[PDB]
Design a protein around this ligand. Structure first.
Ligand SMILES: Cc1cc2nc3c(=O)[nH]c(=O)nc-3n(C[C@H](O)[C@H](O)[C@H](O)COP(=O)(O)O)c2cc1C
Ligand SMILES: Cc1cc2nc3c(=O)[nH]c(=O)nc-3n(C[C@H](O)[C@H](O)[C@H](O)COP(=O)(O)O)c2cc1C
Ligand SMILES: O=C1c2ccccc2C(=O)c2cc(S(=O)(=O)O)ccc21
Lengths: 207, 194
């Protein structure tokens, strides 16, 4: 089995989303000594935004005719997509930043949603089709505040993990589990972290 | 009379969101000859993401004691916030990219939501007053607007409303072109500009 872990917090040792995700990965490895884990850093590394050159290349009507310069514009995207194609399970760790995700993780999504590679379309009278099959995802997220989850007072303000679900679903990753810790700013954060940890150990050991 | 225009499409001449917003701006200037427009590019220029250094500086409990290095970490943020302070009307142009906004615009928001500057806590409260915003957005698909089949999937302009509302900008208008709609948007913008 093959895991791709995408870490989105810019924090290091102090990132709770990174820490929780790494609890999961360690527990998974304990149960699956032969599994391979690849990490793609998008929080502590600036992941480039989509440019006009990326757009021209990624939507070129005859992709085989792309110049070597166009291929250079897509080289990073190709690498990021390949990582996902090589994986069975995608783990994304992310803070909530201003009701969404850190910009680096948005840039990652923007590199991996690719016409003819992770989705396609046909024209009837465009009808989109996902191209990733057989994958699952786990989103591990930390939030300073409270009530962003289902039934929460602030649920409507959450454009972080629900948005990720939609973006991933578009390319075919429909089986998505979310594990959230809340209260990081106040610090019953211990309880929320403890609950997230236990949930992640159960998930790792059953996978 | 003072406008801050934040353009988020990485495309230049070819950008429809940029073009529609510039139609608005030109019409607004004609109607208000004294207006000033500041342009802050976040689509064609790589605006840095929040770093752990940013977080340490921005959430410093005693900001008057920030070192010169920490102030450097916030210098771009201060400039971006300052542009917003100086404006009466914020115009944001943006495509929808993968059900949200291009990453540069997320980066811009992450720089301008600032503890003790654009919001505070006691409960979080907004600190900007007297501003309004116009979001001009373009989408390749359809049904992402109010009452649309895909409304629940729109994490672009509804998310911008939430973030902008948190810092105190709650008079927000959205003009969207989807898929004709552009011509409808263009006519809506000319009317708004007058
Ligand atoms: C730039 C920034 C924006 C944030 N925005 C939110 C937010 O919108 N809602 C929230 O509950 N917490 C917010 N927080 C608090 C973080 O979500 C929380 O500290 C989280 O645990 C950080 O993830 P990490 O520990 O993996 O770095 C924000 C923190 C920062 C630094
Ligand atoms: C990377 C990328 C992602 C896109 N994602 C979406 C999307 O999620 N939904 C949609 O309706 N259109 C999507 N589109 C189509 C654009 O929103 C549309 O072409 C838009 O008008 C571009 O704005 P612009 O002309 O100002 O650059 C996407 C286009 C690109 C290049
Ligand atoms: O609806 C679209 C969409 C939906 C969900 C994810 C991505 C896209 C997209 O890239 C797109 C592009 C274009 S294009 O004009 O750039 O080809 C049109 C529509 C869409």
């Amino acid at each position: 089995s093959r895991i791709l872990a995408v870490h989105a917090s810019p924090r290091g040792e102090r990132s709770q989303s990174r820490r929780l995700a790494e609890v999961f990965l360690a527990a998974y490895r304990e149960a699956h000594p032969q599994a391979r884990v690849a990490r793609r850093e998008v929080g502590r590394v600036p992941l480039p935004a989509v440019t006009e050159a990326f757009v021209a290349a990624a939507f070129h009507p005859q992709p085989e005719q792309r110049s070597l310069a166009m291929q250079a514009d897509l080289a990073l995207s190709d690498q990021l997509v390949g990582e996902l194609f090589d994986s069975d399970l995608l783990v994304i760790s992310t803070p909530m930043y201003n009701f969404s995700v850190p910009s680096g993780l948005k840039a990652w999504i923007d590199q991996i949603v690719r016409l003819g590679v992770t989705f396609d379309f046909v024209l009837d009278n465009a009808q989109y089709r996902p191209l990733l099959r057989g994958k699952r995802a786990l989103i591990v997220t930390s939030r300073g505040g409270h009530g962003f989850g289902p039934g929460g007072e602030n649920q409507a303000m959450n454009h972080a993990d629900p948005w990720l679900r939609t973006a991933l679903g578009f390319i075919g990753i429909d089986e998505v589990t979310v594990v959230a810790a809340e209260g990081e700013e106040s610090g019953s954060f211990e309880d929320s972290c403890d609950e997230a940890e236990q949930r992640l150990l159960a998930l790792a050991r059953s996978a």
